[PDB]
Short mmCIF file of C-alpha atoms in Angstrom, two decimals:
data_model
loop_
_atom_site.label_atom_id
_atom_site.label_comp_id
_atom_site.label_asym_id
_atom_site.label_seq_id
_atom_site.Cartn_x
_atom_site.Cartn_y
_atom_site.Cartn_z
CA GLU A 1 38.73 105.23 98.43
CA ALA A 2 41.94 103.55 97.35
CA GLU A 3 42.48 100.26 99.75
CA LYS A 4 45.30 100.85 102.38
CA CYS A 5 48.04 98.93 103.58
CA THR A 6 48.94 97.83 107.24
CA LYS A 7 52.46 99.22 107.48
CA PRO A 8 53.03 102.76 107.24
CA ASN A 9 54.75 104.63 104.05
CA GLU A 10 53.67 101.40 101.98
CA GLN A 11 50.46 102.74 100.43
CA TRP A 12 48.23 102.08 97.38
CA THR A 13 49.87 103.17 94.24
CA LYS A 14 48.34 103.11 90.67
CA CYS A 15 51.95 103.09 89.34
CA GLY A 16 54.51 101.75 91.30
CA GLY A 17 58.33 100.71 90.17
CA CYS A 18 59.64 104.16 89.87
CA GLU A 19 59.61 106.58 92.76
CA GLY A 20 61.91 109.16 94.74
CA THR A 21 64.82 109.26 96.82
CA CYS A 22 66.50 111.23 99.34
CA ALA A 23 68.12 113.00 96.68
CA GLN A 24 65.48 112.95 93.86
CA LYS A 25 61.87 113.40 94.80
CA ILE A 26 61.02 112.27 91.15
CA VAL A 27 63.04 109.73 89.13
CA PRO A 28 62.56 110.25 85.10
CA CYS A 29 60.37 107.21 83.91
CA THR A 30 58.96 106.30 80.85
CA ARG A 31 55.65 104.16 80.48
CA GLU A 32 57.31 101.64 82.97
CA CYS A 33 54.79 101.87 85.92
CA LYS A 34 54.29 98.40 87.68
CA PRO A 35 50.63 97.36 88.22
CA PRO A 36 48.48 98.80 90.78
CA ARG A 37 49.61 97.51 94.36
CA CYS A 38 50.67 98.62 98.02
CA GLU A 39 53.98 100.41 97.34
CA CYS A 40 56.14 103.79 98.00
CA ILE A 41 54.68 107.12 97.01
CA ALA A 42 56.55 110.14 95.95
CA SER A 43 53.94 112.17 95.40
CA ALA A 44 53.57 112.33 99.02
CA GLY A 45 56.98 112.90 100.38
CA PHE A 46 58.35 109.23 100.81
CA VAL A 47 61.62 108.44 99.69
CA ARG A 48 63.54 104.96 99.51
CA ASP A 49 66.59 104.37 101.77
CA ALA A 50 69.67 102.81 100.33
CA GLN A 51 68.58 99.66 101.89
CA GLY A 52 65.53 99.67 99.55
CA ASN A 53 63.34 100.93 102.30
CA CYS A 54 60.36 103.07 101.88
CA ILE A 55 60.38 105.85 104.62
CA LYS A 56 59.09 109.50 105.18
CA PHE A 57 61.70 112.06 103.80
CA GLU A 58 62.33 113.22 107.43
CA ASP A 59 63.37 109.47 108.23
CA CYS A 60 66.39 110.03 105.93
CA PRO A 61 70.09 109.56 107.29
CA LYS A 62 71.36 112.46 108.88
#
């Protein structure tokens, strides 16, 4: 059971730093994964808004 965070979206991830966007569910990345910590999750369907804000894909701008 991976500890969960308090705010939505931001959830436990074993590899942060890289993620997805409203245009690229998965961004190409090498062995550059930030340490394990609460953050966004592309494997789930969360994207990062231009405001560097992790939010569901449905919460994307029109």
